[PDB]
Paper text:
ArgF displayed a melting temperature of 65.5 °C with 1 mM L-ornithine and L-citrulline showing a positive melting shift of 1.5 and 1 °C respectively.
The arginine biosynthesis pathway consists of eight different enzymes ([Fig fig1]) all considered to be essential for *M. tuberculosis* growth *in vitro*.
Numbering used by the authors:
A (entry chain A): 0 to 229, 235 to 307
B (entry chain B): 1 to 73, 76 to 228, 236 to 307
C (entry chain C): 0 to 227, 238 to 307
The structure:
């Protein structure tokens, strides 16, 4: 068997993504029914930059698969510093059955996956956040049923990891994806091109616009994210793209709202939207647990 | 209907007795209760690290079948509202154990979270330590009601407050001996006096260490702080002279860490009256009992 | 029972070391067949300086014995600062069944072992790396069989923890150990004397030389380690020319991380003589065997 990895959303085909999302629903119903890591077998969970919420979901999910997560956070040097990435992959492959890694550049994830003899999962990177989008898709399916043909609009910084993963993971699910963002913060054209190509296979589509009202019109799902990872109002370009009540009122009447969290209330999203009946952000956060477990189960049995 | 444990008197006298009975049962049979089998998660969050709090809660949770997710010292409230954090945590874990500074943050967390919240240690109270202390006293002396306990040193800190509230809840006559600038918060002292009326207990605050030692069944101290700035406390040192004024079978407690030569001497801490190591062990058993009890009422 | 510790390689007798290494092979074959820590019981894994590869091997090994590792990284209050190491050891002994510690000076390990009522294990220290050498010996045995009478040569910094442990652990196994190192980086004289005395009981021997080529001739095993002060060590590089002077079926060991191009070349590291990846894996099995063995004697 070829060792399978999950570094970006389109690493799964449409049929494979459906398998993972079905497993995510099964594991939400029966969270300790799959024990591929019984022993326990180990899974490495490595953070080049800390993300506490990413750690809750993986550390508990791995335990519920019977395994033991070995968590390495930023306070432990950095992978690649005092020995080669390739040497690190070879040793980790002797201790664990999968490697979950939060890092920056995609080329590091690619290099890890090409040498490691166990599955590598992108927990969060500069370019993609594919585990979050699996959780988003599970949440949408819970609220609306079939994903094919839904219209999803993302608002704010369209150049970030969530914009890229909503494009790739969304069109893989057959969802018509719109990114609404100011012209200096648009999807990477290579990512957009890959999303357009995948969308041809699923009947989906890709739209990029700087007109937030047009992007909201008739949408089934509205998504946003913090505008920056960290005087001058540097986020001024994004404020017209705030997910507020006026924007939500332009979408379909049964539309839902997603936000990967943490939220900066009053910036990219308002209290009224976050706390209103369209919000699915709390189920979405919970589904990180289930969708990541499903991904691990699926990768381990193909690898 | 979700119960929390933020300060000692959050348990009634009857409820405290239930938790302490469970603590003795779990010490005998440490893996006999598995309410967190799965594993289910419990959050263990430190705004400031504590090694003994980490060992006792992390292993206790594991022995209940659970998995502790331990978060060390971005601080809660900085990247998102405490209320948003409380909602996300409630989807991931069955209880939240939190070491933080101000009591108002614990109150805020408990008012929003839909799972039990436990104060692992705060500026104002250390109620899990006092559960361990009460378990230790009971196994050395039997019935708690009517015992005389004196605490010495900094009478304004979390241990003084919790020994007052938790002690009188158990029916113990509690004395705090401290210099006048370091006495119990009057609101806490009043709450302990009111609770003592239900249990036959009493509250005494004094600056006379020798009077407080006389007739005591249990002597307790704690580090004085967390130029001799601690000079005010040195007359309140728990030493052999002070111990010799107490009952001949008195025992000595100290929440740890100890600064030997300051609040307690080597001779007392390593001598036959010391119960400090059993007391430390009982952090594990008493906190396990508390979690079992809160989980079944929530 | 006498509580057994493992702070340096000669804390095991020759017969005891053979028992641990036999157990390591058994546990490599059947990794979850021994569950002395079921419950879970706890094991402390404490780092004064982080070592992620020590963390992986111990944390998963403890889990595979059925236990729960409580892992403490650097950046909490360094042990010894807010209470004595002895007090820390006495409290840890009430929470866990063994203490695994990566620290600096040997006197710190001695301090905890002096009062602990559970086994204390040196995970890695300034003076010794005895768990790595157990893994090394397991690796050598599974490729070459009987250890007595083999020839092992270590190259480079002969004053560091690996040189010391290869001396002590090697002669305990009956191996003729050579340290090839430059002046100013030679073994500590008390360690050298202890290894010479232990070699008398096993038929082993100790050689210390600046002649790297002579040290390679006839060797079954060539070992090196990071040099960190680079100029003195260049003649001791483990390169293809040096390896060719050894036995035709010699194997190469290196406690990771390797600095390729410095103490070892890519050709050696990635060639057919390299046993470094099996060596790293065997930290898991050898440490699990050590824990099983210490627990059942303590």
């Amino acid at each position: 068997s070829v060792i399978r990895h999950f570094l970006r959303d389109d690493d799964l085909s449409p049929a494979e993504q459906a398998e993972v999302l079905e497993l995510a629903a099964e594991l939400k119903k029966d969270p300790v029914s799959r024990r591929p890591l019984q022993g326990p077998r180990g899974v490495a969970v490595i953070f080049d930059k800390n993300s506490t919420r990413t750690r809750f979901s993986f550390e508990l999910g791995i335990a519920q698969l019977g395994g033991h997560a070995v968590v390495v956070d930023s306070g432990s040097t950095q992978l690649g510093r005092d020995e080669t990435l390739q040497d690190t992959a070879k040793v980790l492959s002797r201790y664990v059955d999968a490697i979950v890694w939060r890092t920056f550049g995609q080329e590091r994830l690619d290099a890890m996956a090409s040498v490691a003899t166990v599955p590598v999962i992108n927990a969060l990177s500069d370019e993609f956040h594919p585990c979050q989008v699996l959780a988003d898709l599970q949440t949408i399916a819970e609220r609306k049923g079939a994903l094919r043909g839904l219209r999803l609009s993302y608002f704010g910084d369209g150049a970030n990891n969530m914009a890229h993963s909503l494009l790739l993971g969304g069109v893989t699910a057959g969802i018509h994806v719109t990114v609404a963002a100011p012209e200096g913060f648009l999807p990477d054209p290579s990512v957009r091109a890959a999303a357009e190509r995948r969308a041809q296979d699923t009947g989906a589509s890709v739209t990029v616009t700087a007109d937030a009202h047009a992007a909201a019109a008739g949408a089934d799902v509205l998504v946003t994210d913090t505008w920056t990872s960290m005087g001058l109002d540097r986020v001024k370009p994004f404020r017209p793209f705030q997910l507020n009540s006026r924007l939500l009122a332009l979408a379909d009447s049964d539309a839902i709202v997603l936000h990967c969290l943490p939220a900066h209330r009053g910036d990219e999203i308002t209290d009224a939207v976050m706390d209103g009946p369209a919000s699915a952000v709390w189920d979405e956060a919970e589904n990180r647990l289930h969708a990541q477990k499903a991904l691990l189960v699926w990768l381990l049995e193909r690898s």
